[PDB]
Symmetry: C2
Subunit: 243 residues, 2 copies
């Protein structure tokens, strides 16, 4: 049963964090108890939610209880990241199952882990603790090789650190509807990865791009904008795959 | 092997014909030899393609060869409808497998049949000749009962007239992104019909609404408009289901 979902890609980007934030927002609206964990030392998800805490995931790995670290936001709970997270990576290196053993989130239906790019010990800890992975990529030709690399990594992590790790799906984000180039890249992603690619595609849209600067989810910022409708649908497609 | 696809719903509407026209346009661009047959005495698809012929499907049932009746348009072939089609319905009634035996389209990869609403002898002839059905509905609450009715009809037609008849999918069209009501209706359609509903949803959009008046497919009229991107993706989702 997929309960923990890691959001990860090779190069990171706004699409990944925007996906973590909004997937969480809509899964919550579907009536799910959801925990979003910002595992990036940069704290993009945390900042994208207008949160400013001095206690975060580092303390979770540092022993301090979860219930007193989570911040309620837009219907779900966030375990924030701080510039303190950086410390644990030095030590998490060589300790891949750290996060997993420290994630006493049995009280949630779904747990989303916003992993940093470039496979750092934090990214690895996310992959070692998750059961499903959503790979958010931009509609650019590099995504073909970028995804291939990440899938090979997932295979190796499944084989040596986490047997229940599986790809939930590849998500095309920042689809530039102004061009036909976007169409061509998507077509090639589907031709090469097939059913692994979600049918729901997130469009490039001004309101979606600005939501993080406002520190609000797209549901809060512009609930009827194209990106909001797409993320609402994605939550449904993600639940369909989980089931 | 699904080769013939009927586009049908209970109440008809612009979404159905817009779907027949644009699905054909994009399946053609995928490198498929496609034949679109307008089976509606109203000739909405034919008019939506800027065609004006005096010879159509009636003559096909009237003996005259297909090759000399098809009109090339936007990369595919159209077997037009005329105000003459009405005649055959009187006689097609009681002759459900007429169209099927007169459809010598072995030269095409895919054949789309734009069926009239209200289950007329022409609608029935479409269902008796097709292998797959795409049910285009609008994101309105009536769609719940409208679809249920059509699915019951498909079941009965499969049982008594065409064993290979199957639902390819239910397509939500004219999704009004200005409201959250659209979201609620879609959610209910998926809750009630599940996987039968295509993940690709066609948005309500000005350029898409106007394409028929210009007599052009959305690919010709506004190739980078939201509806164009959605129909391009739908063709891919439809091919995935056919396979």
């Amino acid at each position: 049963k997929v309960r923990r979902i890691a959001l990860a890609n090779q190069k990171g980007g706004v699409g990944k964090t925007t996906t973590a934030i909004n997937l969480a927002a809509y899964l919550a609206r579907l009536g799910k108890r959801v925990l979003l964990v910002d595992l990036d030392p940069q704290g993009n998800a945390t900042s994208g939610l207008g949160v400013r805490a001095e206690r975060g995931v580092y303390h979770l790995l540092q022993g301090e209880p979860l219930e007193g670290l989570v911040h309620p936001v837009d219907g779900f709970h966030l375990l924030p990241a701080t510039p303190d997270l950086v410390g644990a990576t030095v030590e998490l290196a060589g300790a891949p199952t750290a996060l997993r053993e420290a994630l006493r989130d049995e009280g949630y239906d779904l747990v989303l882990l916003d992993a940093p790019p470039s496979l750092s010990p934090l990214t690895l800890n996310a992959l070692a603790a998750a059961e499903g992975v959503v790979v958010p990529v931009q509609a650019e030709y590099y995504a073909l090789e970028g995804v291939a690399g990440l899938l090979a990594t997932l295979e190796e992590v499944r084989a040596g650190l986490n047997p229940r790790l599986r790809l939930l799906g590849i998500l095309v984000t920042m689809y530039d509807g102004r061009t036909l180039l976007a169409q061509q890249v998507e077509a090639q992603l589907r031709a090469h990865f097939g059913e692994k690619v979600f049918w729901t595609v997130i469009p490039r849209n001004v309101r979606l791009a600005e939501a993080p600067s406002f520190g609000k989810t797209i549901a809060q910022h512009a609930p009827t904008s194209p990106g909001a409708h797409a993320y609402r649908r994605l939550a449904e497609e993600v639940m369909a795959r989980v089931q």
